[PDB]
Amino acid sequence: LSPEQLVLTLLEAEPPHVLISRPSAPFTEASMMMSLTKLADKELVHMISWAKKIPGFVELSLFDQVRLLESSWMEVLMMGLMWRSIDHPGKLIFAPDLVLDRDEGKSVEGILEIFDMLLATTSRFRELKLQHKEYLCVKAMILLNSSDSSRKLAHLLNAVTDALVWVIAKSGISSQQQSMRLANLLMLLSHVRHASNKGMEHLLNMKSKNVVPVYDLLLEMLNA
Amino acid sequence: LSPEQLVLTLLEAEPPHVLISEASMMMSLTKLADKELVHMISWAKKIPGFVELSLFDQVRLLESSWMEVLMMGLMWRSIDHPGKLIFAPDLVLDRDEGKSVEGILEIFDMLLATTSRFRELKLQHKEYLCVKAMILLNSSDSSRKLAHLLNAVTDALVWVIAKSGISSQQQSMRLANLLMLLSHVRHASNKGMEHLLNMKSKNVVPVYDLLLEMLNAH
Amino acid sequence: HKLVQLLTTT
Amino acid sequence: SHKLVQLLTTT
Numbered sequence A: 001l002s003p004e005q006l007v008l009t010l011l012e013a014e015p016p017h018v019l020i021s022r023p024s025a026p027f028t029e030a031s032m033m034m035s036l037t038k039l040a041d042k043e044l045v046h047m048i049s050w051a052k053k054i055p056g057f058v059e060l061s062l063f064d065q066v067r068l069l070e071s072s073w074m075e076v077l078m079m080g081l082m083w084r085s086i087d088h089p090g091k092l093i094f095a096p097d098l099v100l101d102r103d104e105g106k107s108v109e110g111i112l113e114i115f116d117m118l119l120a121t122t123s124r125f126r127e128l129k130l131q132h133k134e135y136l137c138v139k140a141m142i143l144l145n146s147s148d149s150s151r152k153l154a155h156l157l158n159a160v161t162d163a164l165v166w167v168i169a170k171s172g173i174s175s176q177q178q179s180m181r182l183a184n185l186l187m188l189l190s191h192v193r194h195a196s197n198k199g200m201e202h203l204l205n206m207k208s209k210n211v212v213p214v215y216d217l218l219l220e221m222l223n224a
Numbered sequence B: 001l002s003p004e005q006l007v008l009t010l011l012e013a014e015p016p017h018v019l020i021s022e023a024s025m026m027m028s029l030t031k032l033a034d035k036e037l038v039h040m041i042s043w044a045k046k047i048p049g050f051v052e053l054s055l056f057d058q059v060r061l062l063e064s065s066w067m068e069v070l071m072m073g074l075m076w077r078s079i080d081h082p083g084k085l086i087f088a089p090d091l092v093l094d095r096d097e098g099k100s101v102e103g104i105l106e107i108f109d110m111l112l113a114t115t116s117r118f119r120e121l122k123l124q125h126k127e128y129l130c131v132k133a134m135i136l137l138n139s140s141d142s143s144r145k146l147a148h149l150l151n152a153v154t155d156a157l158v159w160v161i162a163k164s165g166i167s168s169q170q171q172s173m174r175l176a177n178l179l180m181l182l183s184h185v186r187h188a189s190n191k192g193m194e195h196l197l198n199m200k201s202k203n204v205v206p207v208y209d210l211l212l213e214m215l216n217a218h
Numbered sequence C: 001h002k003l004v005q006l007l008t009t010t
Numbered sequence D: 001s002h003k004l005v006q007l008l009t010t011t
């Protein structure tokens, strides 16, 4: 309800980290693909629970809730990945025991490009010194901006935006610097989204090539 | 440059109005995009700093962003014309005309809806100038110059909004609302690019050399 | 189907 | 094509 209360609600709503183990053997195309898709499937379950904890979300049309999650899920996953990774330069921290290097991307054709984009965008957030409460708001904004229910959605997106504005203002920088910081953060939403688009394309191609396991929720979300 | 003087430079960089002079609709649109791309290159070179980027960086920004820049221009030309996409004075299309080619209605609906969001925010001309430049400069020594140029254009947008006299709170909200709308312009451009690539792979729409070059980058 | 289940009956 | 580079380098 207040911006502080919305931020504290988002903080509480944060998903637990999903635990996946590194394969015993050096990565193959199959084992890398299995690890990342199993993780994605488990994180999607937790994402749905998270979205339902965003104040207001459950009051949207079910069809709106579906469309937003279907639209945004890989962006939300990637924003989470970038945040997990921001304290570990050079690494993509997919999970505590799934810590991947630009070079381990070599195991799957075309995935090194995705890893490079994610590492680069993470580095932009690191240089901006992205803060935890900023991340919370931005991740919610990714979901809510991905698309009477239409009015309610505008209202919910404005509330989260207002929260980010409040978070930035608590930093005590000048009005002009607060505006520049908001703009610099939001201009990265298209870089995360680019990485999402390239990741989704890649995963669809992998599903074609018969390397994606039967994970029910993931396949549903991939297919749209 | 002061932000005011940067915005005036973007006003001065604006491309001329372009006229085209089923199969006919698609030919008109691809003819138009080719003509507009010629003027887009001119425009970019008039953005202070752009020509001092590496040629590689100049090329990659234009290759990355061109469809997004075309679509942002279309939305601006359409803002005061509800229900219509003002491609050109002699190419005014609606979603009924879009239905005539598979895949085009979806795109037109997206463009119309995003235009409608800009109309509701009452997007201002100088805001449009800054965001169109930002689209180009934020697209997927030279590195530092580019970051400086994007920061300069971002500063100019912040200044435009500051000049509206609305409250400080409302300035931050407005900035966020405008910037969030650009991932919608970019989605529309992803859908359009996909559609045009499919049209090219089928040889259904004509061979315009600059357009083909710019499509082939994708 | 699974998405709608998780949204509404969990 | 090299029309983009041609237009970037001429007026």
Ligand SMILES: N#C[C@@H](Cc1ccc(O)cc1)c1ccc(O)cc1
Residues within 6 Å of the ligand: A033, A036, A037, A039, A040, A043, A077, A078, A080, A081, A094, A111, A114, A115, A118, A199, A200, A202, A203, A204, A206
């Ligand atoms: N990068 C990446 C992952 C997606 C991903 C991103 C973030 C997560 O938290 C979990 C998974 C991927 C998987 C298969 C592909 O074919 C392409 C990309």
Ligand SMILES: N#C[C@@H](Cc1ccc(O)cc1)c1ccc(O)cc1
Residues within 6 Å of the ligand: B026, B029, B030, B032, B033, B036, B070, B071, B073, B074, B087, B107, B192, B193, B195, B196, B197, B199
């Ligand atoms: N919409 C649209 C146009 C692109 C376009 C956009 C803005 C302009 O100012 C000029 C042209 C299109 C053309 C061919 C396709 O196969 C699909 C879409």
